């Protein structure tokens, strides 16, 4: 049907792509391959050369000039394009050939395959101080030349391509995680119980998430308030491992129950970029250049392998606490207040047959 | 699931009123929602649309400043402010939902409203 | 600035089965963000066709469409008695969205 093409400053290469956004199974990943149209009287050093490349690159400690990034290669693989080699003997995608066709005999293609359990696209809520190129993880491939691997890039010769790393939620249904509590005090042995529902693991954005929580009050003290909480949970990998959350919404209920009481009750919550755009460092999916993409996916792991992957991973739990009226020969000096928390997942399904456009409402 | 409209009626120029439509299933942030008019025997012409996840709003210049939206999630319903009103502007107004995840179409549209002035 | 929409023929009269297409161009490139509509008198539009390409479901086979270059157009195989309506050819690449005048069956 169509295709992306771009080319390069010294109006000698021009690069074909058949898509930009690649899928990851976590039982496996796409392959990427494509093709790429040469001048040949315009080189003479009779080596030609491009390499796909993976990295973790933000704002380095704190260089402030433009491009000083950080440069974690979390994976690198290169390939000679031209002249060919013994190693290229390898079966093509029917649509290759058709664009050779649709070209010449003037064209040499290149393909890579990505190992599994690597960082997925994400980025950095970039706050008004962030005036600087975007953080976050980045998937890219360079198309250059030279006569001896020594040689370094050249502006005019020299051209750069991104992609994105995403998965799509699981088909199959998964389990309705569930939790419940006990507390106990000191002074009557009628322990508080606690338990809160939901209604699915998965959900998509935009989509409302409800929860039914039950309460059992059996002591003389009596609950006064109970707080909402969906906080998103970052990991963080450069030098070492680093964790923190950031809340993304919340409410405290006004409910209160009188002494060795039950109630039950059900809530509502749904999370929304407008009410946290003045917050850094926000999970956020990978953007291109500067499109507005909407809050990061749940990562879902490298299935049962639970390996030490490096780079960004996210998750998100819902939590709720309890606030207890103080009193009794206790006072201030003790703590009063119980909780719980419960996983889940929030993403896109798979797109039908059509992927994500590029800022359809352009202004 | 359908969308239900109303807030309209016969009035003298200048004034101006509160055109409303109500959703139902779906929430604000689940979608966005655009406005068209339709002068009578012409065609359509797009004039407002909101944004509730980006909180973005958009509208015609021939409508700038002197209309605007205003929606609330609790209510699934939205609100048409404007003011400065030309006779001529009488058409027939259409509401209608579109996915926010991603917008390729229109799907729902409500049984329209009409205005008019004396 | 705004998408310049010229679409033609404007109406059509003829017997019931014929093939007949209905063309669509813009004053600029727009890829693919295209889509086509459908309305009756009295009633609200209905969409046909989005990405330019795609078919909504329930949509008969013989509605078609495709896309040339900066030209689009659409067209039904065979017509039959009951699809005399009004169509539209739309764009949403860009803001201010802007429809054509619209299509007459007869």
């Known amino acids: 049907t169509r295709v992306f093409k771009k080319a390069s400053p010294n109006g000698k290469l021009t690069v074909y792509l058949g898509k930009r956004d690649f899928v990851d199974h976590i039982d496996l990943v796409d392959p990427v391959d494509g093709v790429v149209l040469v001048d040949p009287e315009y080189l003479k050093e009779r080596r030609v050369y491009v390499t796909l490349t993976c990295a973790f690159r933000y704002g380095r400690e704190d260089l402030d000039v433009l491009g000083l990034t950080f440069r974690k290669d979390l994976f690198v693989a290169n390939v000679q394009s031209f002249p060919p080699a013994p190693e290229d003997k390898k079966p093509l995608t029917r649509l290759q050939e058709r664009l050779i066709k649709k070209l010449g005999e003037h064209a040499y293609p290149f393909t890579f395959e990505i190992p599994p359990n690597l960082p997925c696209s994400v980025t950095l809520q970039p706050g008004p101080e962030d005036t600087g190129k975007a953080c976050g993880v980045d998937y890219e491939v360079k198309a250059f030349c030279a006569e001896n691997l020594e040689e370094k890039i050249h502006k005019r010769n020299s051209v750069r391509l991104v992609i994105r790393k995403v998965q799509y939620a699981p088909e199959r249904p998964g389990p309705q995680p569930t939790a419940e509590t006990t507390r106990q005090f000191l002074m009557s042995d009628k322990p508080l119980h606690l338990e809160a529902s939901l209604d699915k693991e998965i959900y998509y954005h935009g989509e409302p998430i409800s929860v039914n929580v039950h309460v059992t009050n059996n002591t003389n003290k009596t609950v006064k308030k109970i707080k909402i909480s969906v906080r998103q949970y970052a990991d963080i990998c450069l030098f070492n491992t680093a964790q923190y959350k950031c809340p993304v919404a919340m409410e405290e209920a006004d409910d209160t129950v009188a002494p060795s009481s039950t109630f039950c009750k059900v809530y509502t919550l749904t999370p929304f970029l407008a009410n946290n755009r003045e917050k850094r460092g926000l999970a956020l999916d990978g953007k291109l250049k500067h499109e507005d993409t909407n809050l990061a996916s749940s990562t879902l792991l490298r299935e049962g392998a639970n390996r030490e992957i490096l780079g960004i991973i996210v998750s998100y739990k819902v939590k709720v606490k309890l606030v207890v009226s103080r009193g009794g020969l206790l006072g201030d000096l003790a703590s009063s207040d119980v909780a719980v928390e419960l996983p889940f997942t929030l993403m896109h399904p798979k797109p039908k047959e059509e992927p994500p456009h590029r800022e359809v409402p352009e202004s | 699931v359908q969308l239900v409209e109303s807030g309209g009626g016969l009035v003298q120029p200048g004034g101006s009123l509160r055109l409303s439509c109500a959703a139902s299933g779906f929430n604000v942030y689940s979608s966005s929602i655009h406005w068209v008019r339709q002068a009578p025997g012409k065609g359509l012409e797009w004039v407002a649309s909101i944004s509730s996840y980006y909180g973005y709003t958009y509208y015609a210049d021939s409508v700038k400043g002197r209309f605007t939206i205003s929606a609330d999630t609790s209510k699934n319903t939205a609100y048409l402010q404007m003011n400065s009103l030309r006779a001529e502007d009488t058409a027939v107004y259409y509401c209608?939902?579109?996915?926010?995840?991603?917008?390729?179409?229109?799907?729902?549209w409500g049984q329209g409203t009409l205005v008019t002035v004396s | 600035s705004d998408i310049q929409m010229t679409q033609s023929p404007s109406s059509l009269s003829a017997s019931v089965g014929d093939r007949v297409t209905i063309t669509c161009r813009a004053s600029?490139?727009?890829?693919?963000?295209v889509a086509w509509y459908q309305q009756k008198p009295g009633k609200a539009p209905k969409l046909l066709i989005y990405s330019a390409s795609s078919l909504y479901s329930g949509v008969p086979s013989r509605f078609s469409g495709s896309r040339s270059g900066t030209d689009f157009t659409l067209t039904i195989s065979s017509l039959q008695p009951e699809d005399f309506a009004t169509y539209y050819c739309?764009?949403?690449?860009?803001?201010?969205?802007?429809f054509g005048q619209g299509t007459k069956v007869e």
């Open positions: 600029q490139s727009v890829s693919s963000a």
């Open positions: 209608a939902r579109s996915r926010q995840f991603w917008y390729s179409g229109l799907d729902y």
């Open positions: 739309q764009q949403y690449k860009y803001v201010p969205v802007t």
